[PDB]
Write an enzyme that holds these catalytic residues in place. Sequence first.
Site, short mmCIF file in Angstrom:
data_model
loop_
_atom_site.label_atom_id
_atom_site.label_comp_id
_atom_site.label_asym_id
_atom_site.label_seq_id
_atom_site.Cartn_x
_atom_site.Cartn_y
_atom_site.Cartn_z
N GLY A 116 -8.03 39.50 156.75
CA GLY A 116 -9.30 40.59 156.68
C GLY A 116 -10.14 40.16 155.50
N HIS A 138 -11.39 27.98 156.94
CA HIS A 138 -10.65 28.57 158.04
C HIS A 138 -11.23 29.65 158.70
CE1 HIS A 138 -8.31 31.19 155.19
NE2 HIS A 138 -8.16 31.71 156.50
N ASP A 176 -10.15 24.29 151.19
CA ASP A 176 -10.38 25.26 152.10
C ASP A 176 -11.74 26.27 151.77
OD1 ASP A 176 -10.44 27.08 154.12
OD2 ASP A 176 -8.94 28.30 153.17
N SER A 221 -9.43 37.19 153.86
CA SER A 221 -9.74 35.82 153.60
C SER A 221 -11.05 35.45 153.50
CB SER A 221 -9.28 34.92 154.86
OG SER A 221 -7.98 35.59 154.91
N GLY A 222 -11.37 34.42 152.79
CA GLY A 222 -12.80 34.02 152.71
C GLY A 222 -13.58 34.83 151.41
N1 LIG Z 1 -2.69 37.06 149.60
C1 LIG Z 1 -2.02 36.81 150.54
N2 LIG Z 1 -0.79 36.93 150.84
C2 LIG Z 1 -2.88 36.31 151.78
C3 LIG Z 1 -2.52 36.81 153.24
C4 LIG Z 1 -3.40 36.16 154.18
N3 LIG Z 1 -3.22 36.53 155.67
C5 LIG Z 1 -4.40 35.90 155.92
C6 LIG Z 1 -4.78 35.83 157.31
C7 LIG Z 1 -3.73 36.06 158.35
C8 LIG Z 1 -3.89 35.79 159.61
C9 LIG Z 1 -5.32 35.45 160.01
C10 LIG Z 1 -6.50 35.40 159.07
C11 LIG Z 1 -7.67 35.07 159.50
C12 LIG Z 1 -8.60 33.97 159.13
C13 LIG Z 1 -9.73 33.54 159.57
C14 LIG Z 1 -10.27 34.42 160.78
C15 LIG Z 1 -9.36 35.55 161.16
C16 LIG Z 1 -8.20 35.80 160.67
C17 LIG Z 1 -6.00 35.44 157.76
O1 LIG Z 1 -6.99 35.15 157.03
N4 LIG Z 1 -5.11 35.59 155.14
C18 LIG Z 1 -4.48 35.70 153.86
C19 LIG Z 1 -5.02 35.52 152.49
C20 LIG Z 1 -4.12 35.82 151.39
CL1 LIG Z 1 -4.52 35.19 150.03
#
Ligand SMILES: NC(=[NH2+])c1cc2nc(-c3cccc(-c4ccccc4)c3[O-])[nH]c2cc1Cl
Length: 223
Positions: A175, A40, A84, A177-178
């Site tokens: 931020g 993603h 993913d 993610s990935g």
């Molecule tokens: N541990 C968590 N509670 C969590 C919260 C997140 N929140 C995000 C997220 C939220 C909005 C946009 C993106 C995003 C993804 C790809 C490109 C730009 C923003 C996120 O990764 N990723 C997440 C990944 C995790 Cl594991």
Amino acid sequence: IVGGYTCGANTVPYQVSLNSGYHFCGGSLINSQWVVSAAHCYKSGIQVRLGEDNINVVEGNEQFISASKSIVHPSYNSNTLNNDIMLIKLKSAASLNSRVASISLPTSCASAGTQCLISGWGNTKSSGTSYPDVLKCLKAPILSDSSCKSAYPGQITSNMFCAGYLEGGKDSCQGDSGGPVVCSGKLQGIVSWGSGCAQKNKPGVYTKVCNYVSWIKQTIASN
Ligand SMILES: NC(=[NH2+])c1cc2nc(-c3cccc(-c4ccccc4)c3[O-])[nH]c2cc1Cl
Ligand SMILES: [Ca+2]
């Protein structure tokens, strides 16, 4: 990373920043020409930034290379975020050393209770945006499958695992993610999704890399 600490410049040599004019996701260097991130986080026009610590200042040790191709897993489902994972080939190989090095893929999956290191330049607040300039770290345990399923009923597949603190306060966030989830020196997870950040009873969900090892190897081998 909410509730984490500053890692220390270059103490996480396999961490990469995916940049398209700003930092948007993290990734893990697995060899001098390939990075693994989340599907993603895909987009065109990606520049991979290795040896970074403060993402807004060049301080030395940085290597910026453009991605040659991005291979999103063919069964990636954007609705469930199952599978993913994505591989990025670099236009030229990176120079590995002590500040830029690859991380190993696992041979076995990890068990609940295993302690892992999660890092990234993601938000440090669960309420509002506050992104840091330097790399943050968090040590978190893999939770049991039952705690994961009680928290996200009907939303966990066999390619995901939860890690974190059910009491809240410490978690990965947007931020991040990935990026990598490393346990005992092996890349076991990829920051994938969660409900908010650092919320009580809502741990982070990660892609279970051990189930993709054969695929990663076959795919890198044929490209
Ligand atoms: N541990 C968590 N509670 C969590 C919260 C997140 N929140 C995000 C997220 C939220 C909005 C946009 C993106 C995003 C993804 C790809 C490109 C730009 C923003 C996120 O990764 N990723 C997440 C990944 C995790 Cl594991
Ligand atoms: Ca920098």
